[PDB]
Amino acid sequence: MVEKCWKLMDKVVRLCQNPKLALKNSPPYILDLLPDTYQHLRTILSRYEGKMETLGENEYFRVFMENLMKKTKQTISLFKEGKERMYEENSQPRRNLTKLSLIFSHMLAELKGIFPSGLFQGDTFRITKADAAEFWRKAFGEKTIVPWKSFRQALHEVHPISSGLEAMALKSTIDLTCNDYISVFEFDIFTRLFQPWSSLLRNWNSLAVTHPGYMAFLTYDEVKARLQKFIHKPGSYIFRLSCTRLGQWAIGYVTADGNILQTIPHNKPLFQALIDGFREGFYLFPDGRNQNPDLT
Amino acid sequence: RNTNEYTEGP
């Protein structure tokens, strides 16, 4: 199965080397991610020499490899079906290749977080927010991976989800690897982004559900492309998950001098960065709109 | 190492 994944990954790579794609070198870059994923799988296999049956039984690893095969087939099939539209930036098929690149980036980050050094550590994974940790240990103990439905019902007991439509918005926010499971790593990422835990889902409602500035699955170059249309409107800004620093936010904005910059707020929650940035005249027009949410 | 340009905030 592992060798079937390599040949599928290999095929995606060859599809992505087509000069017609004019494929942007910036993260997330499938030409980096796939060989990096291969190298890391190679590392895991090497540490499990002999004890290959322990590895082959690990629940997380089983879910991982299944998703990897499924994502790589889905990418192959996207080229097959999209044909010439793969080359028109702005085509839906091309947008889907970008979303897939992001999903591969999230998969590799999750793999590395669960198998750092190639040995399974999902059961000893250290959850960043102490409140969030305590919820995970209480409901799931030392499990690495739980089905969406089962994550949803446990979370709902402590932080009520308003509606099925919000549950689905929530799922597409937290399930970075897009596989209907929630890992302890994905949980850590979400609860870092949307802390504090005490108001977790109201934070996420304010920052993502009702905020026009939030860009679910958007890369650095897509932010830059999107703000380009607001180049004559200084104070326009949008924000999103950083791809390369998973767990932290990236804000893109148009300066009065006609630059498009992106920054990763530190030592300041998103909430405060956004409010300060409003007040200082930098973050005024979320996705170029005249009206800005009041996050106070 | 392949990175995008992230710079200091305003």
For residue A180, the Cα-to-chain-centroid distance in whole angstroms is: 14
Q: Which residues of B touch A261 (CB under 8 A)?
A: 7
Token digits for A258?
Answer: 């006609």
Domain-by-domain residue ranges, chain A? 1-121, 122-210, 211-296
Burial of A15 (C-beta count, 10 Å sphere; 0-12/13-18/19+) = middle
Asked if A265 reaches chain B (Cβ–Cβ under 8 Å), the answer is yes
Letter for the amino acid at A212?
Answer: P
Distance from CA of B8 to the nearest CA of A (A): 6
CATH of domain A211-296: 3.30.505.10
Q: Which residues of B touch A26 (CB under 8 A)?
A: 2, 4
Burial of A224 (C-beta count, 10 Å sphere; 0-12/13-18/19+) = middle
DSSP A178-225: -SSEEEHHHHHHHHHHT--GGGHHHHHIIIIIS-TTB-TT--HHHHHH
Strands A249-254 and A260-263: antiparallel
Which residues in B have their CB inside 8 Å of a CB on A? 2-10
The beta-strand segments (E) located in A40-175 are 145-147
Q: Say how many C-beta atoms besides its own lie within 10 A of residue A168's C-beta.
A: 12
Note whether A237 and A213 are within 8 A (CB). Answer: yes
Q: Is A126 helix (H, G, I), strand (E, B) or coil?
A: coil
Q: What is the resolution of this structure in A?
A: 2.2
Distance from CA of A263 to the nearest CA of B (A): 5
Residue matched to tokens 């929630």: A182
Note whether A35 and A53 are within 8 A (CB). Answer: no
Note whether A218 and A237 are within 8 A (CB). Answer: no
Q: To which H or E segment does residue A72 belong?
A: helix A59-82
CATH of A1-121, one of 1.10.260.40, 3.30.70.2740, 3.30.70.140, 1.20.930.20: 1.20.930.20
CATH of domain A122-210: 1.10.238.10
H-type helices in A17-58, by residue range? Answer: 30-47, 52-57
Token digits for A9?
Answer: 């990954």
Tell me which residues of chain A, numbers 140 to 179, contact chain B at a CB-CB cutoff of 8 Å.
none
Token digits for A118?
Answer: 């190639």
User: Which of A264, A267, A268, A272 would you mutate first to test chain B, the one with the most B CBs within 10 A?
Assistant: A264
Q: Judge: B10–A250 Cβ closer than 8 Å, yes or no.
A: no
DSSP A296: -
**Ramachandran angles phi, psi of A271, nearest 5°:** -45, -55
Q: What angle do CA A33, A174, A34 make, to 5 degrees?
A: 10
Asked if A121 reaches chain B (Cβ–Cβ under 8 Å), the answer is no
Tell me which residues of chain A, numbers 19 to 58, contact chain B at a CB-CB cutoff of 8 Å.
25-27, 29, 32
Note whether A60 and A145 are within 8 A (CB). Answer: yes
Q: Judge: B3–A244 Cβ closer than 8 Å, yes or no.
A: yes
Angle between helices A59-82 and A2-16 (to 10 degrees): 30
Q: Is A134 helix (H, G, I), strand (E, B) or coil?
A: helix
Q: To which H or E segment does residue A105 belong?
A: helix A92-114
